[PDB]
From a paper:
Here, we present three high-resolution X-ray crystallographic structures for distinct macromolecular assemblies of the capsid (Cap) protein from the beak and feather disease virus (BFDV), a circovirus infecting critically endangered parrots. These complexes include a 10 nm assembly, resolved at 2.0 Å and comprised of two face-to-face pentamers of the Cap molecules, and two 17 nm assemblies comprised of 60 Cap monomers in the absence and presence of ssDNA, determined to 2.5 and 2.3 Å resolution respectively in the same space group, arranged as 12 pentamers. Each Cap monomer was comprised of a canonical viral jelly roll built of two, four-stranded antiparallel β-sheets, with sheet one comprised of β-strands B, I, D, G, and the other sheet comprised of β-strands C, H, E, F.
Five capsid proteins were present in the ASU, with the unit cell comprised of 480 Cap proteins arranged as eight icosahedral VLPs. The assembly buries a total surface area of 182,920 Å2 (compared with 13,650 Å2 in the 10-mer), with a notable shift in the ratio of intra- and inter-pentamer interactions, the majority now occurring between pentamers (68% involved in inter-pentamer interactions compared with 40% in the decamer). The interactions that occur within the pentamer are comparable to the 10 nm assembly, with each capsid burying 1,934 Å2, mediated through 22 HB and 4 SB (compared with 1,660 Å2 for the 10-mer assembly). Each pentamer interacts with five other pentamers, and every Cap molecule within a pentamer interacts with three other Cap molecules from other pentamers. Two sets of these interactions are identical and together bury 3,390 Å2 (through 52 HBs, 4 SBs), and the third interaction site buries 774 Å2 (mediated through eight HBs). The diameter of the VLP is 17 nm, corresponding to the size of the infectious particle, and exhibits a volume of 2,171,590 Å3. Differences in buried surface area between the two assemblies, 182,920 Å2 for the 60-mer, and 13,650 Å2 for the 10-mer, suggests that the 60-mer should be highly favoured; however, analysis by AFM and EM shows a higher proportion of the 10-mer complexes in the absence of ssDNA. We proposed that this is due to a destabilizing effect caused from the repulsion of the highly positively charged ARM domains present within the 60-mer when ssDNA is not packaged (overall charge of the virus interior is +1,960 in the absence of ssDNA). Analysis of the electrostatic charges on the interior and exterior surfaces of the particles revealed a highly positively charged interior surface, and a possible additional interface for DNA binding. These positively charged surfaces are distinct from the positively charged ARM domains, and mediated through dense clusters of internalized Lys and Arg residues (R46, R51, R100, K102, K105, R109, K154, K155, R160, K163, R164, R167, K169, K230).
Residue numbers in the entry:
A (entry chain B), B (entry chain E), C (entry chain B), D (entry chain E), E (entry chain D): 42 to 247
Write the structure that this text describes.
Amino acid sequence: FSTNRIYTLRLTRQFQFKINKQTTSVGNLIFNADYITFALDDFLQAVPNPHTLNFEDYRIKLAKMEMRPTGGHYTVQSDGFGHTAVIQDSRITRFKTTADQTQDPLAPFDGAKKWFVSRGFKRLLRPKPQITIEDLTTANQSAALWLNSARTGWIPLQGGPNSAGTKVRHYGIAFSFPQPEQTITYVTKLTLYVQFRQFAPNNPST
Amino acid sequence: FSTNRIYTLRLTRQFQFKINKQTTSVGNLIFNADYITFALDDFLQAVPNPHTLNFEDYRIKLAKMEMRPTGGHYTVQSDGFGHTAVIQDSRITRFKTTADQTQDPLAPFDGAKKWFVSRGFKRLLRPKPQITIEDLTTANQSAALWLNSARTGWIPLQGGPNSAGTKVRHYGIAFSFPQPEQTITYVTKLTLYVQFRQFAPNNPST
Amino acid sequence: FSTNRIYTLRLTRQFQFKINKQTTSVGNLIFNADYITFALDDFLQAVPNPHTLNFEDYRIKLAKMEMRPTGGHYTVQSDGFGHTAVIQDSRITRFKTTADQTQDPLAPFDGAKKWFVSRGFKRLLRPKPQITIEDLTTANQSAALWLNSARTGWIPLQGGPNSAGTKVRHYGIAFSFPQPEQTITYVTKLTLYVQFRQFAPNNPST
Amino acid sequence: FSTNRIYTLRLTRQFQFKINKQTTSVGNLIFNADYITFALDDFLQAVPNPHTLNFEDYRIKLAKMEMRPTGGHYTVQSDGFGHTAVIQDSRITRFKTTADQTQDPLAPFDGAKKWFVSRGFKRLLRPKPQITIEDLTTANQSAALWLNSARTGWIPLQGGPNSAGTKVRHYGIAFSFPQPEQTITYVTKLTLYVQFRQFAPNNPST
Amino acid sequence: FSTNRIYTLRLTRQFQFKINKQTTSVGNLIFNADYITFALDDFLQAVPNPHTLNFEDYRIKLAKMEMRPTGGHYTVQSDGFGHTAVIQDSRITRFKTTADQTQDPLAPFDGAKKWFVSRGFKRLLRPKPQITIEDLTTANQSAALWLNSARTGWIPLQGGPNSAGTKVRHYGIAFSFPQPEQTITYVTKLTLYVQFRQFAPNNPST
């Protein structure tokens, strides 16, 4: 039971997602996209999970997204195919489309994988936290950097000036779809595979 | 034909299960759950099974639950996915939910396994009987303990002050589900793989 | 991440203990004794520890008691020697002496180990939970039984009719001492080495 | 004599520490704690050390804390035992207790190590600098990350907009103690084992 | 980084395709067909792709066509089978039928592979650019030749009197279908696997 003792937990949460009936540019093929990011706090605040953990540091080795249709949608009712893409930086926010796309906005990505709208998808990835760089050629601007291996660093749960280590946003997976003729509802399940370092007491009483 | 002669039987029973049309929080994703426990008497009292066995002891090596839809439900009509979980103590009783859950109540369990509402599931487990402990730090309260291996102990069919050995409750499997848009009926089949020890006569005449 | 996934934690708590100045049978050698038992709940209720754990079962592999003098007592100030003894059943309650003993009440025990009053002691043991036996030759009486190996069974945290699995009392260590000429205060630290089985969600919302 | 030429130095500083006579809840066992962090500037500003170094980068491979009693305190006068803990993030600041603790606030830590109040302690550690993350799920908040190996990065002594590279705070070691019956004064010695990269000139004249 | 440095990219674009409800020769089996050709410019003009590439030469090593039904068409709804055929010259233009065929117009082709109307198809091919021959036995007529291996030649992006290297038409894939009883809409995804030679600057400023 040393300072560097490691523990590994699996955490999950679920939510609903809707792809709306096509009501624009009717009769034509259009695409839209959304995305998901991963933060430990998102999973600890879920009702059935432990809301605090007695560990000093953590690191997300792996994340999983699984979206499957519900609401009585027929799997054999073909509604075309879109793509998933692993986007491991904050650029992913641009891929929640605010306007109809005339092409699949994620298909050109290296690593883009096809998925059929009526079946959903399942994909694993290594989501990345974003380290800060403030020394840019333009003043008063910052950029990001992320590490190739999760074993390189640790995120303290209560480190930093906000004690908000569990809220670090790890990027990230996006998914696109051709707009269907009828609304489709999905059940989404996210999973985190997290390593924790150093069992720790509660903060001292004040 | 010694005192420790062993016999093995397979026992089964069936019953109907209903997942009700969602009539609460319509438009939201909600989850509920139920559970099953195993007792030898539950199977011997089934109509087509032998209602009494001429053995002195028994032990349940393995149990099995299969739930498949009926009532004309389409397997290709997707209604999301829930989870099954092996819960081998009386805590399982809390997982027959009495209120709608905003998250899958069983997914966080180690060993939780996904299953699709429209296809049902099949799972095998080693259900455990609960040994009594009455020496707790709070007076007049009791707790439970179960044994890691079924080969460790035997249960007399007629042992104890009530001769109710066959009614020992073995835990246990729970299953959760997102509430669907229509009612779904299932056929559930349970199977016990039971070892019996010592062929025995009837009780003496009185 | 299976049903049988195991985790191991170290838990500790501390408290003060006093051996009072001898005020009886003055000038003569007398002995007294006290004892300690181990319950998981005792450690989870300690301020700096997690007060609930999200595991389904547990088992105490090892327990440790360490009592050391404080309050400015000189280690080189000899006050004789007493004994520690591992007593793994409820008989230990008789060894909190209510009357002065003319002999060391724990020395005859097999496994009794000497300890010097002015230095304290440190001892590891395997504490035992007490399984119930109610079939005795005398009516309306029960007795106990404990298992040789901790790997034999599991205690569900919320199992039993009281959901008080963490309050099972594990026996046990006692310690005796010759009554000193002046009061001595000690700091006692207990440690549990506990294996937990099956990461589990919170109980469903009601 | 290349750009990546490395030099290693040992640096030290000392200071006094006091554990105060217990004047609150007299008669009860209470605990308090304090902590130490490491910054190169803390050592260079010490009177007998070089106040500026002609190197471009540095990295702290190892740090060391030794606290031994003084003021005439007897080592054979027992005052119980507390614990030391390696806490490598800014959470350590909470472990300078501002209120009396009823339990040892550091004992539950993985890696916690006992130490006797009357003898002091000595412990080595790998203290960590905190890298900034500004992309959290809560807007305008930040968190930290540190690297598992000191060989992964270098800290420029004069890098950044403030040329304050030597002031990076490396975490960290905390120590707890039961409050004694009399005041105890200590001499604390800290030691840094620091690698430096690239012998460098003074800044150009202006 | 030599003149012959090669880069390889994957490029994709999508569009809609309709097979119209049969309104001619009703009650009888009829067939129609269409075709696709490949030009780098077709993919660079697509909205999400880079519209200019800074390379000197290119060559298409592989092309892919995937057409899948959408619009709510049931995959389990049989509508017969047609064929795909790789036609690597401009004769393919004749196989966009302008009159109903009483036989499958592509089935006789060597390499013809059947596909079911209700599931779509996926086929890979090596599309061919057409080299000009003007020396024919008939005056003022020209013919075509293509090379067996893609490694034999390179197409400069801006070569020729029109700088229209990216507009070379590569042949080619055709697909036939028996006319269904109801209209069927498809999503079509084309993919190019293109090797580029010699990273190049922009054209000089004028």
